[PDB]
Amino acid sequence: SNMWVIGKSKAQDAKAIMVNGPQFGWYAPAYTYGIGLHGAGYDVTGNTPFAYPGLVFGHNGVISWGSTAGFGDDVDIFAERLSAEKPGYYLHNGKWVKMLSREETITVKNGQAETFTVWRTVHGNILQTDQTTQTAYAKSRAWDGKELASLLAWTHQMKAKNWQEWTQQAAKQALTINWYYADVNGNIGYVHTGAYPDRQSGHDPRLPVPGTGKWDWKGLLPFEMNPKVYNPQSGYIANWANSPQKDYPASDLFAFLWGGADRVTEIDRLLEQKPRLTADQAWDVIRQTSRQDLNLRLFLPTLQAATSGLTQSDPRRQLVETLTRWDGINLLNDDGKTWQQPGSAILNVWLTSMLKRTVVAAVPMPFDKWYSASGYETTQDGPTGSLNISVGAKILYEAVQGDKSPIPQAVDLFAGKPQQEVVLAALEDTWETLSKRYGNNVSNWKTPAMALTFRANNFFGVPQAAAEETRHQAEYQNRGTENDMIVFSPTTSDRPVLAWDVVAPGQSGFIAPDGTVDKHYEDQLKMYENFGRKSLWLTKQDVEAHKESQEVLHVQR
Amino acid sequence: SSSEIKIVRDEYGMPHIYANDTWHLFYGYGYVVAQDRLFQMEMARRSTQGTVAEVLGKDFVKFDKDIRRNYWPDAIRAQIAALSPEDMSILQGYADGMNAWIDKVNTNPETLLPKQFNTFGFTPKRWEPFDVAMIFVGTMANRFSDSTSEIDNLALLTALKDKYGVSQGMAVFNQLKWLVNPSAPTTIAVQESNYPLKFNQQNSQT
Ligand SMILES: CC1(C)S[C@@H]2[C@H](NC(=O)Cc3ccccc3)C(=O)N2[C@H]1C(=O)O
Numbered sequence: 001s002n003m004w005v006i007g008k009s010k011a012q013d014a015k016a017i018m019v020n021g022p023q024f025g026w027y028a029p030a031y032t033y034g035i036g037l038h039g040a041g042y043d044v045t046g047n048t049p050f051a052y053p054g055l056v057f058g059h060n061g062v063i064s065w066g067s068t069a070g071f072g073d074d075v076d077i078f079a080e081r082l083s084a085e086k087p088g089y090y091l092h093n094g095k096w097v098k099m100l101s102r103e104e105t106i107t108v109k110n111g112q113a114e115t116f117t118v119w120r121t122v123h124g125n126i127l128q129t130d131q132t133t134q135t136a137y138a139k140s141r142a143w144d145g146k147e148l149a150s151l152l153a154w155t156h157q158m159k160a161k162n163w164q165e166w167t168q169q170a171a172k173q174a175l176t177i178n179w180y181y182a183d184v185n186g187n188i189g190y191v192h193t194g195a196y197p198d199r200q201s202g203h204d205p206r207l208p209v210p211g212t213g214k215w216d217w218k219g220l221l222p223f224e225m226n227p228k229v230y231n232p233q234s235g236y237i238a239n240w241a242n243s244p245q246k247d248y249p250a251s252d253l254f255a256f257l258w259g260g261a262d263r264v265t266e267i268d269r270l271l272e273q274k275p276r277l278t279a280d281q282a283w284d285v286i287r288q289t290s291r292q293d294l295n296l297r298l299f300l301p302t303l304q305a306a307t308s309g310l311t312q313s314d315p316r317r318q319l320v321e322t323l324t325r326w327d328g329i330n331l332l333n334d335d336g337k338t339w340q341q342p343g344s345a346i347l348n349v350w351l352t353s354m355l356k357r358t359v360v361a362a363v364p365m366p367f368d369k370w371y372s373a374s375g376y377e378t379t380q381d382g383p384t385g386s387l388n389i390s391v392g393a394k395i396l397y398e399a400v401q402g403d404k405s406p407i408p409q410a411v412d413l414f415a416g417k418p419q420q421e422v423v424l425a426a427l428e429d430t431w432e433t434l435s436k437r438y439g440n441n442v443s444n445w446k447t448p449a450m451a452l453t454f455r456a457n458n459f460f461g462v463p464q465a466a467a468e469e470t471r472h473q474a475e476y477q478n479r480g481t482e483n484d485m486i487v488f489s490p491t492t493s494d495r496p497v498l499a500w501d502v503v504a505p506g507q508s509g510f511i512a513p514d515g516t517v518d519k520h521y522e523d524q525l526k527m528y529e530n531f532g533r534k535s536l537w538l539t540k541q542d543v544e545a546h547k548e549s550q551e552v553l554h555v556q557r
Numbered sequence: 558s559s560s561e562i563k564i565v566r567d568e569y570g571m572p573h574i575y576a577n578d579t580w581h582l583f584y585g586y587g588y589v590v591a592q593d594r595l596f597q598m599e600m601a602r603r604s605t606q607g608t609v610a611e612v613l614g615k616d617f618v619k620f621d622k623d624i625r626r627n628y629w630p631d632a633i634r635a636q637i638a639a640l641s642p643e644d645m646s647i648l649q650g651y652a653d654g655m656n657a658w659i660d661k662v663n664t665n666p667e668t669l670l671p672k673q674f675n676t677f678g679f680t681p682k683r684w685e686p687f688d689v690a691m692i693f694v695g696t697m698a699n700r701f702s703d704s705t706s707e708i709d710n711l712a713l714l715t716a717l718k719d720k721y722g723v724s725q726g727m728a729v730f731n732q733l734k735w736l737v738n739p740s741a742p743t744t745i746a747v748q749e750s751n752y753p754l755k756f757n758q759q760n761s762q763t
């Protein structure tokens with residue numbers, strides 16, 4: 001997920017601009033739900049995942065809001081001590097405490113029902129067991145017991161009319177989520193919301209801790225600690241799953257890092273490229289980032305250094321020069337299948353080879369596999385989610401940064417070998433691999449583009465539509481599942497706010513019994529593809545003037 | 558009228574709900590949701606509660622088991638029971654709204670039942686506040702804020718210590734899975750502020 005909020009100091013023809021691109025994957029029917037609420041203290045418009053009571057993406061005509069995953073470390077694993085005698089118990093604070101447990105029966109269509117038991121300790125639900133050393137692992141979430149408060153905070157925040165009222169609700173949202181704020185007066189803000197544990201001194205949040213009691217969390221950190229900013233000197237707020245703040249620690253997932261190499265820099269340079277941006281230009285950042293190869297900028301300098309001293313006719317030097325002319329922005333050929341430039345395929349093959357030679361070589365199996373992905377891997381259906389710099393690539397980047405990297409290279413990923421030599425050998429692999437497949441005339445290489453698929457199974461992998469309802473989009477776009485933009489105090493409009501979003505395939509997933517698809521079943525699918533957008537209405541006047549249908553219910557509770 | 562709920566859809570079918578009190582407002586929300594996305598929401602309900610095998614069969618048993626092992630329903634119901642009347646009205650109204658349409662669907666299925674229900678061989682049932690809450694809980698909390706690989710992490714560190722020895726192995730773990738990297742691009746510039754907490758990165762809990 002990405003988001004950029006443009007404040008008064010950088011907005012052109014407006015006071016504030018908010019462009020949100022939450023990335024959940026692509027699905028049919030649409031992942032989010034368009035909805036306007038007017039009454040009971042609410043006056044909002046926008047769209048939201050699975051139609052939660054609270055709109056994750058929308059505005060109330062005075063403030064607008066958005067989110068991206070926080071990726072803070074709000075989950076720790078406790079190692080519970082078990083005993084062969086007294087099964088179902090675990091040692092905690094000197095006493096054998098009884099675990100919580102419940103019976104569950106999985107009913108099965110055309111199959112046998114299965115009943116099993118789920119176990120829980122004071123630390124969380126039990127994962128796996130291990131009656132050798134008699135240990136079971138309990139997963140401890142800092143947001144435990146705050147699920148519903150987070151749901152209500154996401155709802156109530158919609159009623160806020162300024163920074164203070166909004167942060168009041170942000171303080172109650174316990175999941176690890178980045179919240180973003182903008183308002184009609186041009187103010188903008190960001191909060192890394194979430195409940196975070198106050199860990200014992202010496203507790204490494206990356207590794208398990210004993211559950212015998214001495215390592216129990218002291219409690220939860222106060223809202224004061226949550227990274228937050230209001231009207232930043234920079235005049236903008238940009239995030240693409242990157243770090244909230246200097247020295248803020250990331251999720252403990254081995255596959256996830258915040259380091260020198262971060263895709264968010266792609267957004268930064270575009271917002272900093274111009275002193276001010278208009279609504280259309282801020283929106284255009286979607287298209288640009290959608291098509292931006294994320295590895296070119298990171299490794300091109302290393303590629304250039306290594307090949308600067310090679311002669312004209314060296315093939316490897318030819319591949320780097322190819323990359324040097326390229327702006328990294330992928331576009332489709334008229335065939336709607338291949339990319340006009342072979343840049344990503346070159347980077348993909350090269351990077352894959354580097355990782356194999358460096359990070360993967362230094363890591364004991366089978367853990368080595370964790371760092372072998374180049375980040376381009378996909379299926380014929382295309383990425384299931386966003387494209388990112390791979391964890392192995394981020395580690396490699398620190399290594400080619402040399403001393404300019406703040407990360408001590410305890411071991412040399414290049415095994416004493418000249419960094420140039422390894423980079424060159426990987427370029428040698430790349431040329432051999434690619435030339436053998438496409439020929440030796442690079443200028444006519446038509447490498448396959450990634451496609452995009454709105455899937456009929458939801459992110460769980462469970463059908464939410466029939467298989468034929470799956471939709472295809474030729475051009476993969478590294479963009480939000482939906483995109484919405486709120487523009488406050490637009491100078492060319494009669495209204496103090498304008499907003500747009502795109503909810504593809506369409507607002508409706510309904511198909512009548514006779515197979516007749518709803519009029520709004522797919523009327524946003526082409527719009528999504530073309531980077532188009534449709535207006536979100538808020539006022540009674542705009543809603544009325546744009547009504548297609550109406551209905552009035554009379555009900556008492 | 559206190560009992561009146563107005564529903565106005567724009568030319569993209571997007572519903573706007575007009576109502577006086579909370580229960581009515583979210584009743585209208587759930588109503589239009591049940592109209593637009595009934596099958597999707599039914600399958601999301603089953604996904605977040607681990608009842609998919611009930612209608613899709615054996616291949617989803619592992620899935621169902623995993624969902625239920627990942628949360629504690631009684632704890633969720635307890636939080637719902639603690640909600641103020643006002644907050645409860647949100648979930649109850651939302652749930653009642655869906656039911657109002659689901660009842661109409663099951664009364665005239667030959668015209669109103671989403672095709673998918675016929676195709677997958679079952680019909681929709683009524684929702685309660687719990688179901689609405691679990692949509693959020695199962696798709697945002699238990700899946701989007703529930704990440705950890707500590708057990709693997711310890712396995713990697715252990716393998717690194719065996720390979721490079723104790724000190725060097727610890728240092729390489731700090732090279733592949735650092736706690737912080739000061740060169741990390743941040744959403745908040747350093748001039749604004751920095752994070753005050755520093756955690757231990759030597760695994761002293763052992
Ligand atoms: C655990 C995650 C759900 S977090 C990450 C990413 N999610 C986002 O980029 C944004 C987002 C998530 C939840 C709610 C709002 C926004 C996404 O997708 N990722 C998932 C993963 O790592 O498998």
Ligand SMILES: [Ca+2]
Nearest residue numbers: 075076205252
């Ligand atoms: Ca942790």
